[PDB]
Every structure is written in C-alpha cells, then in structure tokens.
Amino acid sequence: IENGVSMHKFLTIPRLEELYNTKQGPTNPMLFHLIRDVKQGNLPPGYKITLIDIGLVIEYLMGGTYRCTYTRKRFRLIYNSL
Amino acid sequence: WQHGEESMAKALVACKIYRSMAYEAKQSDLVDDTSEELKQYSNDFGQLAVELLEQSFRQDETMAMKLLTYELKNWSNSTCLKLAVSSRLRP
Amino acid sequence: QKSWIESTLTKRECVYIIPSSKDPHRCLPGCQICQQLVRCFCGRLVKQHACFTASLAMKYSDVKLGEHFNQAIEEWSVEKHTEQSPTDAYGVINFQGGSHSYRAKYVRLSYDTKPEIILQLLLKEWQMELPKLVISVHGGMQKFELHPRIKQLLGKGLIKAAVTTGAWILTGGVNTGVAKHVGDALKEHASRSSRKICTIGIAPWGVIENRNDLVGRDVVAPYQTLLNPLSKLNVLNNLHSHFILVDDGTVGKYGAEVRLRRELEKTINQQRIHARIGQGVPVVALIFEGGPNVILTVLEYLQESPPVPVVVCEGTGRAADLLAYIHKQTEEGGNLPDAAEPDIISTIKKTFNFGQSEAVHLFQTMMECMKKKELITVFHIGSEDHQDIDVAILTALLKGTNASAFDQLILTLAWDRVDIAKNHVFVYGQQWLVGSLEQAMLDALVMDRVSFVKLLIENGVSMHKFLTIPRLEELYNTKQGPTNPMLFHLIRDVKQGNLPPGYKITLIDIGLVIEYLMGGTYRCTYTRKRFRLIYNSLETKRFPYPLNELLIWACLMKRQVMARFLWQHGEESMAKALVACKIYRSMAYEAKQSDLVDDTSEELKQYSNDFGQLAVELLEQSFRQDETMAMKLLTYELKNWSNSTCLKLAVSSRLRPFVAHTCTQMLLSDMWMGRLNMRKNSWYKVILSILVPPAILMLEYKTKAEMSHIPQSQDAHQMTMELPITRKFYAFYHAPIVKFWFNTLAYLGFLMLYTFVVLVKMEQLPSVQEWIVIAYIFTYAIEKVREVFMSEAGKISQKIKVWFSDYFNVSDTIAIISFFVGFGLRFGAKWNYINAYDNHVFVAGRLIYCLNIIFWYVRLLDFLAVNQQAGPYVMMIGKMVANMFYIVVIMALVLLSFGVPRKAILYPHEEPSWSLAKDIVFHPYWMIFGEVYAYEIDVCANDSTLPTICGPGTWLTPFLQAVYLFVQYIIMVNLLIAFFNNVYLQVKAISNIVWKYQRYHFIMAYHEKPVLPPPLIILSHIVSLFCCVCKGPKLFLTEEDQKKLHDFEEQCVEMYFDEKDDKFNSGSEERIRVTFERVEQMSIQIKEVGDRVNYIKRSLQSLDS
Amino acid sequence: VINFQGGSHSYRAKYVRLSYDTKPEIILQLLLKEWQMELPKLVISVHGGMQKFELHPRIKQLLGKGLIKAAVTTGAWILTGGVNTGVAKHV
C-alpha cells in the first residue's frame, strides 16, 4: 500500500470472489456453515461462493432490516453481467 | 480497519458480525467451538469504538453526539448508536 | 457561476496552431502527416486544440496557411494567441499511500493571474492562516539519495522550524527533486505537524504524468502515487497539501512558475505579520543539492531590495557543498585569496560540463554572492553547527539585515521562540533603547506570550516602571489576544444593564466588577477617592504593587498560565491565590447563570480550585516550619486586599481544605480558649467557676505573648498590658468556651423546666416554671434577630438568605414561631368550662407546646456538635437521610402494594372514609419494626383475634403478608444495611470536613455573643444598646513583627518551590527519561567516535608507510 | 534596603554608605549586631580585572559550583567589589 498499490483499482469482483473461496490460507470452516444455512440447507459439490450469498450471510448476522450492497438491484444486475 | 473512513462505524459492524458468528458457533455441533475467540474479537472492536467515542467527546461534545446519529449510507443507512444497541454493547 | 474561482481564474488554451518546428517525420505524402504528426508549437497534435472558434480549420487544412514568412512562425505568443477562458478544474486530489489518503488541493490557474489574486485565493477561498514565515526551498531535480545522517536531520529541523512558526514551505511539488526530500521528511514527522505545515507546490501544468486526471471542474479526482514506468514524466508528491498548477504552454515546457511563485514571495512580505506588530512577513530560502539556474536564483534573492536571506546545507549535493566552500575562500565581504580561477572554476567545470564556455559565467555569479555572506547562512554539518537547521533558518532572518534588536525580538515573539531570542538576541554587548523592551512587554502580555514576559523581567524590565494606568487600561481593552467574552457581560451587569457603542473599559468599572465578584464589604483600590480623583486627572501615575493588578487582569481575562506566572512574583502569595480562587468561583457562577453558548463554568471552577490548592499547600509548608507564625498568616490584615485576611478570603470562597487544615483548626481552638490556658485547666473547673465566681481567681490564664498569634478585640488587647483581679473576670466571661457552657447550662435548665411544664397538669395562669420558659424563648428570639441584623453583608436579603441555610436556624425559627402561637392560644383562651380540655383553644395551645419541645431537644445536637467525635456523626445523620431517600421510597411503595389488598380482602363492606387511608398504611408500617400481628394473620383460625373478619378470600392474606415481609426485611432492610456499610467511609470523611469548616462560623459567633445567657441576656441587650447611644477581632502586630512575618511568608514560599523541583527531579520517572535521552545522545557519539577511531585506522595504514 | 527586580525575586540587599576613614572595628560591629550576621568560618576575597566578556562554558559552570560549595559548606563571606562590571559579575 505504501509503495503504491491502490485498493480502489486492485480490488475487483472476481478477485474479491477468490478471496472468499481460497483454501490456501487460514480459512474459517464456519463460513460455509452459515452459507448452507441461508441458501436452502444444501450445497452443490464445490460451490464457488458468490457475493450475493455473502450479502445474505451479513444480513442474517447483522439482523433486523439490514440490507447489504451485495443483495441490491444494481449489484444483482451487474454481477449477472459479469 | 485503520485504513479508510467511518472507523467507529466499521468497528461496531465488526463487533456485531463476530457476536452473531460467536452465537451460531455456540449453536453448532462442530468440535472447535471458537465462540470465545469470536466473542473476544467482538469485544476488541467494541472497545475500539468506545475509545474513539471518548476521544471525540473530549474534543467537542456536540460534534461527537452527531457522530452517534448520522446515517452512514455505506452501512444500510443505520447509525453508529443503532449498531451498538444491536450488539448489546453497553459501554 | 456560484463560485469566485470560476469567475476570476482562467485557462490558457492554444487557439493558434503554429505547425511543429518545420519538418515532417517520414511518410512521403504530406496531407495526412501535416495534419497528424505535426503537433503545434503549442505542444500537442492538431486535433487536441478543439478550438470552439476554429474547430473547422483542421478539416479544411488547418489554421494559418503554411508559408507565412518564416519570421512570423515564432510570432506565436503565450500572451496574444491564447483565449483566456474559465478554470475547468479546481478540487481535491488524494493519495492512497502511508495509511492515509493525504488529501490536497489544486486551483489550476492560468499563469498570468495577478499576484494579489493568489493571496485572496490562499486566505479566504482556501481558508488558510496567514503564516509567520515562508521557506522557499530550491535545488535540482532527480537525485538519488543522501547520507543517512543528514537526511534524518534536515527534516527534523525543517519541520521544527515550520511547525513552531506556522510557516509555509514553497516547493515545486513534483516528486522528482526538491519536493521529494521535503515530503520524505514530512512522513518521518507526520501526524505531529500534519495540521501546521501548509506546503504549497507551485508546479506547472506541463511536466506531470496524468494532466487529464487532474482536470474536472470541482472534482475529487483520485490521483495515483505509483511511479508510472517506461517514461520520464513526474508525479505530484503525495505529502503536500496545496497545489497551484499553472495552465499554459504544454507538456514538457516547465518554465512558467518563476513569474508567479516569486510574486507570492513578494506579496506575503508586504503583509503585516500580526496586528500588534508592524514588521512584514519574512521570507527565507533553503537551497539543498542544487543546479545551475539555482546559482542564478540565489544571487537573484540576495541582490533583491530587500534581500531575501539564504541557507546552504553543505554536503547535500553540488550547489550546497560548492557554495559552502566557494563563499569560504573569501574576505568577509571583499576579495578572494591568491588567484582562485584554477581551483574554483575547476569544480565548476567538473560538476557542470563547461570547458570555459560557461565556466566564467558561474564564477561571476559566485563572486557576486560573496559580496553578501552575512545573508548566506551555511549549515556546517559535522561540527554540530546551530543544531538542527531551525536556528540556521530562523537566525538567517536575524543575521545582518540592519534590523534593530527590537525588530529581532518582536519576530521571535510572533514566532513564539524564546530559545532563539535568549541565545541570539540577548547576547553579551547587546544594547537597547529606553522603551523598546517596554513595548515588547506590552506585546507579550496582550499576546499571552508568557515565556517572553519571563525573558524580559530577567533581562531587566521593571513592572513598577512599565505598568501605568493607560497601558493597564489597554490590556483590558485589547481584542488582539485570547480575550474573555464574559468580562463585558459582568461589566454591563454592573454599569446599568447597558453599554455605549465601543466602550473603552475604565478601571473604575474593573473595580466595580471585582467588588461584585469578591462580594461582601470588599472595596477595591480602583473605586477609592484617590484613584477616582487622579484617574479624572489623567510616581503618581504608577502603581505600588503592579503584579497584584496584573494577577487580577489575567484572572478576569481567563489567562491562567499568565496568572500562575504572575502569581509567583511579588509578595502575599497565599492571599493572591485565595483572591484568584474567589474571582474565578464567582465568574464560574455567573457563567452558569448566562444563556451564552461556551459555558466555561468547569474551566473557571477548575482554575479556582487550582489556586485553592496552592493556598492550601503554602499553608502546609508554613505550618511545617513554625505553627505559631503560620497561624499569624491566617489573620494579619493585608492592606492591598481591602484589609481582609487570608482566612476570611478562604471562607468567602467556601474553601474547605484551607479552613479544615490543622493550622486553621489549631487557631480556632486557641480562640475558643480565650485568655484561659485550657492545657493547664480542665473543663470541670470551668463549669465549677461559672457556678463559683470566686474560683475564677484560681485558673491558669495566658500571657500576652502566648496570645500574640490570636486575634483580639480592641477592648481585649488593652487589658493585655498587665493580671489584676477585675481584669481576670473579664478574661473569663468573655472567653468563647465560657459563654458556651454558660449558655449550655442555661439551656439544659430551660429544658428541665419546659419538660416539667408539659408533663405536669396545666392551670389557667402559667406557673413560675412556664413563665421562665417563655422569658427564655422570647429573649432567645431577640438574640437571633440581633445575629441576623448584624451579620456581615449589608444587604438584608443576603443576611436573611444565609442564616436560613443552616438546619438549626430553620428549626429554631419554626420553634419560636410555633411556641407563641401556642402561648397565644394557651394564654388567650377564655375558660367557659371549668374542666380544662373542654376548651379546645387551650388544648391546641398545650399540644403545640408538647410538639414544640421536640425542636428544643433536637437543638441539643447542635451543642453536642461542638465535640470533635460527636459533631461529625450529627452531620452524617442528615447526609444519610438524603442519600437513603429512594430506598425508602421503594419501601413505601411495597408497603402500599400490601396494605391496599389486605384491607380490600378483609374489609369488603366499607363505605368511603378517611380511616381507609389509615388502615392501608398502619399495620404494614409496624410490620417493618418487628410486629407480625401473629393472631391476625389467619383470621379464620381458632386462635384468631379477628374471628368476625373470617370470610371468603381471607385465606389470601397470609400469602400476601409472607411476601411483604420477605421483601421488606430480607431484601429492603438488608439492602439499606449494605447501602450504609458501603457509603460510611466517604460520608464520614465529607462530614468531618464539613464539621471542621462550620467550626469557623460557630467560634466566630461566640466572639460577638453577649456574656449573659438568654434569660438574663436582656440586660446585655438593654445596657449595650443604651451605652451605644451614649457614644471585629483583629491581630495586632508591631512593625518588627510585621517585618519578621513578611519574611517568614517569603522564606516558606521559596522552600515550597525548591521542594517541588527537587521532588520532581529526584523521581524515578524523571531520572529514567533523562537517562533515556542521555543514552540516546551517547549512542550517537559512541558510534561517532566509532567512525573517527575507524578513520584513525586510516592513519595506521598511511603513517606506517 | 535596595532591591533588584530580576530573576523572579526582588533579591534584596543592604547598604550603609559609610565615609571611608571609618575605624576598622566599627565594620565588625556594623556587620555582626547592626546587620545581625553570623560570624563566618571562612572569608573568600576574590580579585581580578573589570569588564571582560565571557569564559569557556566548561569553566564557567564549574567555578561557581565549587565557589558556592566552598562558601555554603563553610558559612563563608565572599568579598567582592560588587559592581556588575567584572569580578562581581562572575560571582
């Protein structure tokens, strides 16, 4: 960051997608347990995680009427376009 | 956390995320419970929010009270106070 | 346009389309490329011009047909052929970098903007504080690095110089040179000076990476900070805060800054550095690591009218290390050594590849620079020269500029740099005019420059001669410093409620404010005849004690650091601290009673308690040296503070730690004794002597010397000259301890009789016992009216209001009034019936007596409160009642929650009656106190005492009562025990202080109480009154005793500060840090010697062969 | 009793202004009972020239440090010319 990487330009949807899906670091096993509890109780074979699902987890955790940017129209439309 | 803006809000969102994660870990039959590791991470960010509030309050009381109630617009139009109440953060 | 920038500052777009130099690149046909490659001498390809006027010139062929008489191709001018149009970009760039965005600003003005518009842009449009200094750095571009020694230091001084002086650092901004070293120094001292140093990059709109990203009218353009490779273009250095980009010309041409940046260096100087000050803002230049056009610029700044001085940090690079030695080979302002053409122009040829084609031109620029070396400061690195350039930058403005030392001093004063002035302005041999150091004192006081007031007092300013009426008038009226808005609010409240338009404050008005704040009978020197006469007439126009008058100034202006300083100077330090406590306390009160916004009632209440603690700590110091002389300090009249005493001032401010101090308590105990030595005597011989008058002649009395520290009445001090027989009776009956027991025995005999009256049957006429009781209360009542209408404060409504603040005076008032209602009904009742108690007016009278007597038994707690053990417990009882209130409210609610259901279940056939109010509260209350009413609980049992109450639902009441008592005893009674256990120590402690404090008013009261007690007191009323028609305690000191006491005060204040400096300098925390800092310093020299000894190894090689 | 408005104290002093040919004993009587001075255990009679600029910052700090120490530990008198243009200045 100091030497001049810019997170505004670095971070993208597919990169940020990867960062959730990596099993190449100190992961959290429990994230899947929260995803499968919001999806339908099930999971496909490998299930590369989506950001709409992350949005759904946050709403469950943050509770109430919290609505996340990842579950909004514009993100839901553009992500379909990616 | 130390990078960007809305540092007091981000700390309170982190407290709420970890608190709710700690709860469902306490309600899962897994082996590594991780409900005191997460409840401790929640209280670490909880303390950060409290300490930033004290800092703001020592500078200007009237502007610090505004910080509790301005809508955030990156965090679902909530307020820092409502986020703290959501996490049962008494301090 | 809704913006001053959009309507004022402009762009410079090249409308005229000179083809590039002449020649096309390649590509045989010359219609595509004469359009395409052939840029403008503007400096861009042809289509980028986008000329709103001549947009259709390129489609045809271009503007300006080719041939055009070659002369007229250079005829393009930035001046002429360039449409001045709006800005099109001014906003806020950012820099994603070292954990912050590090925001900044740009205007992107044209180039030929007028010089004044910058100053208007900088100060109101950008909202920048006008600085006290301007550092204009210069040098060359794109150099690698420096010695790690020098690099760390140059910042450390450059920062320090700029932060301590609110300076601007003018750079080029671009991160390819001078700006880099500036910025790299900022991050090593960032988040310490990130809000005081307003660096400005006046760079061009030419050489820069992304010129188009900076574009955008009122945008927040997210500019990068990555070195864009495969290029030479440069970036705006992130750690700058302001930019003035210069729209002209093109990319690559970077010459349009000297015309503007220089003007800013000229227009800031024509501004006045401060309002009170008349000198212009200084400009300095720090050249490090320079180039060929710098050496032109250095001489262009020195030759200027007036000269702008120059700093040169040797070893940074060529121009620095060069000049540092090129102005070392010279006379002071004259000629060079033995012919220096070879060695000087050698390096000028080596550093700059010249070969005598441009090697004289620089040397000619050098020999002009050495004509003024007094302005070329040079920072000799290695030999600790001026210690971290801040001296070197700042002293350069104080080195030779034929500026008087008065101007050298003010400049330090505006900078707030004392170390500079003391070490470089107050130098040996320095000489001053007569009132130059006086005008410098007036400025330092108005500016709240406390440390410069110290420097001037030491160096020899005299406040006895400095301070005058008109000067001291000014100091109140200045709006050129940290004023107090509230002073006017106190003035307009004492004047008439109004104010004239400007109202230059007068000192009589200040005198009136102080009297209002100090209260009571305080009369100030400023409202006296002599001052009121002489001030009308405005040594006579001086003050005898000027630091008493400035202490008042500093405390009314809410200038505390100046107040503490001024307090430490002069005499009467304990008194001044107590006056300051009272002034701030009263100011804090009226701030708490004003609808203003900045309440400042905790800032003032804290300043009051700061001086309050100082007085307490000086008393302790004095008490540890000599108790008897310390007690004299409490009571000597001051004569500069309205003839009050230090103790009365402390009582005025309700300052309990001073009054509750053991010294004050020792004095109060000695005044209690009177002339009686109650160390050689016993309390039972006093009581024996009140009843046996001739035993008065066999008590151990005190000598006039033993009474020297005790204030006395005038009549009491005249009978000290000798002890004859009649003088000894005076000494006894006028002692406060005797008046107490003499009133206490009379009061006990009063209660015995009044208890007899209420307990024994009452006839038509009052008995002898009842008459004596009435006489006591009547005369006791007159005695209380005497005490109110002779108290202290003139105003009845204040005398009234204070007396009804004491618990027992409220009760005594109720007691006296209720008694004579009772006597009126008792005595005025006509007996129509022979059997008393048939006459209700009589009964109401007698029942008032039986209830009035409760007041008089409880007043015995006031007598008992004279004991040191008992008295605090009496104070505790009232404090605990207040504190236990809400626990008892909850208990009262629990009581009703039980009482109402019980009565309703057990008594369902009741009509409305006030007995219902009794019955819901009566039995539930007595349950709290150990009465369960055992044979009424189950009303349907065989052993029940209420068998007729047995009915439906009555089986519920035992369950209710079981719950009720669980809640009351098991929870609420034990919560109250736990409450009292846990607050006992803090309440006992507060009650001891309050007991000790109220001992002043109690003992002082018995100095003005008559000798005779309240039945026989009437003689002392009638006689004393009548003798007055026929016509406080003071400490008396000889002149020698006043001398030895004023010296004692001074000695003990000196001990007080010495023991603080030696307690702080001897603490482990202070010795660790001085050890820390000295180990930090050595760790440089150890390594430094380490380098030298490693270079004395270079000797070993060369010397041995 | 003259005074000296200076380094945070008046720094008081005294003068007799005697003639010149006063007898020698009268000084001792003046010093001990009239001025009430403790007879010393030492007398330092400094001498030197007048109106010199300054000393090495090494020596300056030291000469006092010893001169003070010698005089305070021994209840000594330091006889000077008094005038602030020489010997007295350094004292």
Ligand SMILES: CCCCCCCC/C=C/CCCCCCCC(=O)O[C@@H](COC(=O)CCCCCCCCCCCCCCC)COP(=O)([O-])OCC[N+](C)(C)C
């Ligand atoms: C002949 C007979 C005719 C007349 C007879 C009747 C005469 C009546 C006699 C009344 C006594 C009068 C004493 C008043 C003293 C006032 C001055 C004073 O010091 O006040 C102070 C104390 O606060 C009070 O004094 C408030 C009233 C106290 C309660 C007094 C009556 C209680 C008993 C009634 C029981 C009734 C029971 C009924 C059911 C059984 C002011 O308050 P403070 O000290 O600043 O407190 C701050 C608190 N803090 C620490 C939490 C901040």
Ligand SMILES: CCCCCCCC/C=C/CCCCCCCC(=O)O[C@@H](COC(=O)CCCCCCCCCCCCCCC)COP(=O)([O-])OCC[N+](C)(C)C
């Ligand atoms: C700073 C605080 C302390 C000082 C406060 C001091 C002032 C405080 C206030 C004090 C006044 C209190 C009230 C007084 C009585 C009036 C009420 C009443 O019922 O009266 C009765 C007596 O009426 C009489 O005329 C006979 C009483 C003689 C005067 C005694 C009271 C005044 C003395 C004051 C001594 C204190 C003065 C102190 C020194 C100046 C009238 O009723 P009746 O006629 O009997 O009955 C009629 C029905 N019948 C048919 C059955 C007959």
Ligand SMILES: CCCCCCCC/C=C/CCCCCCCC(=O)O[C@@H](COC(=O)CCCCCCCCCCCCCCC)COP(=O)([O-])OCC[N+](C)(C)C
């Ligand atoms: C450990 C020891 C205790 C063991 C517990 C075992 C419980 C067994 C329960 C027994 C209930 C039955 C006994 C009485 C028989 C019915 C008729 C009768 O005689 O009624 C009697 C009253 O009593 C009532 O009318 C009802 C009493 C109910 C409450 C009993 C306690 C319940 C448990 C605890 C509740 C607390 C909460 C519990 C949960 C936290 C009539 O008596 P009387 O008043 O003389 O009326 C006659 C006169 N009259 C006609 C004029 C009115």
Ligand SMILES: CCCCCCCC/C=C/CCCCCCCC(=O)O[C@@H](COC(=O)CCCCCCCCCCCCCCC)COP(=O)([O-])OCC[N+](C)(C)C
């Ligand atoms: C949450 C905690 C719960 C606590 C336990 C549950 C509560 C206790 C349970 C008790 C059992 C219930 C008793 C039923 C008896 C019926 C008999 C009858 O005829 O009526 C009776 C019931 O009516 C009453 O008014 C008495 C009720 C008992 C009150 C107990 C209070 C003490 C609480 C103790 C708490 C400590 C517990 C200790 C630990 C276990 C009244 O009799 P009588 O009016 O005389 O009737 C005429 C009869 N005669 C002709 C013979 C005279």
Ligand SMILES: CCCCCCCC/C=C\CCCCCCCC(=O)O[C@@H](COC(=O)CCCCCCCCCCCCCCC)COP(=O)([O-])OCC[N+](C)(C)C
């Ligand atoms: C203001 C300051 C006062 C100071 C005191 C000094 C001055 C006052 C001193 C004395 C005055 C005495 C007057 C006596 C009058 C003669 C008639 C009489 O009363 O006879 C009684 C004898 O006497 C007693 O029974 C004594 C009653 C008073 C008790 C208190 C005295 C001790 C306190 C004070 C002295 C020690 C001091 C203690 C403290 C260290 C007999 O009873 P009776 O009363 O006739 O019966 C009435 C019945 N009837 C109404 C139904 C009809």
Ligand SMILES: CCCCCCCC/C=C\CCCCCCCC(=O)O[C@@H](COC(=O)CCCCCCCCCCCCCCC)COP(=O)([O-])OCC[N+](C)(C)C
């Ligand atoms: C600040 C000043 C305030 C007070 C001002 C003064 C107030 C003056 C008040 C009252 C004066 C009353 C005069 C008489 C009125 C007519 C009635 C009459 O004469 O006879 C009637 C009196 O019946 C009663 O009940 C009288 C009760 C009055 C006393 C109230 C005291 C209040 C003081 C509170 C304390 C305040 C403390 C204040 C300080 C905190 C009946 O009498 P009878 O003829 O024998 O009838 C026999 C009937 N039988 C057949 C049933 C047997």
Ligand SMILES: CCCCCCCC/C=C\CCCCCCCC(=O)O[C@@H](COC(=O)CCCCCCCCCCCCCCC)COP(=O)([O-])OCC[N+](C)(C)C
């Ligand atoms: C003719 C008659 C002949 C007889 C006359 C003589 C008879 C006797 C007369 C009086 C009785 C008291 C005598 C004892 C005194 C002890 C000495 C002492 O130290 O006192 C102290 C008490 O100071 C006071 O102010 C005490 C007040 C007494 C009245 C309260 C009675 C309470 C009754 C309610 C209870 C119900 C009981 C009711 C009983 C029915 C004063 O000293 P100090 O200030 O504490 O000193 C501390 C400071 N130091 C450490 C520096 C020293």
Ligand SMILES: CCCCCCCC/C=C\CCCCCCCC(=O)O[C@@H](COC(=O)CCCCCCCCCCCCCCC)COP(=O)([O-])OCC[N+](C)(C)C
């Ligand atoms: C006949 C009957 C028996 C006789 C009665 C026995 C005699 C009476 C007993 C004790 C009286 C004690 C005397 C007071 C001691 C001094 C206190 C003082 O100075 O101020 C205190 C105020 O005070 C209060 O707030 C109330 C004081 C107590 C009143 C108690 C009345 C009795 C009934 C009540 C219950 C009724 C309820 C129950 C009804 C069912 C201070 O408290 P504070 O505010 O925390 O401190 C500030 C102090 N400062 C301002 C000096 C800094």
Ligand SMILES: CCCCCCCC/C=C\CCCCCCCC(=O)O[C@@H](COC(=O)CCCCCCCCCCCCCCC)COP(=O)([O-])OCC[N+](C)(C)C
């Ligand atoms: C919430 C539970 C629901 C309620 C039911 C279960 C509760 C337990 C048991 C049962 C309830 C009591 C039944 C036994 C009594 C009936 C017989 C009777 O007549 O008794 C009496 C009346 O009694 C009534 O009229 C009943 C009143 C019930 C009030 C509610 C109870 C509190 C429950 C709260 C529970 C919380 C426990 C504590 C918290 C943990 C006696 O009447 P009598 O004298 O015969 O009438 C003749 C009148 N005459 C002569 C005028 C003509």
Ligand SMILES: C[C@@H]1CC[C@@]2(OC1)O[C@H]1C[C@H]3[C@@H]4CC=C5C[C@@H](OCCC(CO)CO)CC[C@]5(C)[C@H]4CC[C@]3(C)[C@H]1[C@@H]2C
């Ligand atoms: C928060 C608390 C809730 C409960 C409570 O306090 C506040 O609410 C109050 C209301 C009161 C009643 C209002 C009016 C009357 C009528 C009157 O009629 C004269 C009859 C007869 C007299 O002899 C004429 O001859 C008799 C008294 C009575 C019934 C009151 C009783 C007390 C009560 C119940 C009080 C009770 C303690």
Ligand SMILES: CC(C)CCC[C@@H](C)[C@H]1CC[C@H]2[C@@H]3CC=C4C[C@@H](O)CC[C@]4(C)[C@H]3CC[C@]12C
């Ligand atoms: C409501 C009326 C008619 C009935 C009687 C009221 C009761 C509560 C009155 C009558 C006399 C009163 C007492 C008279 C004197 C004192 C001494 C005082 O220092 C504290 C209050 C105290 C202790 C009073 C408390 C309340 C009291 C006991």
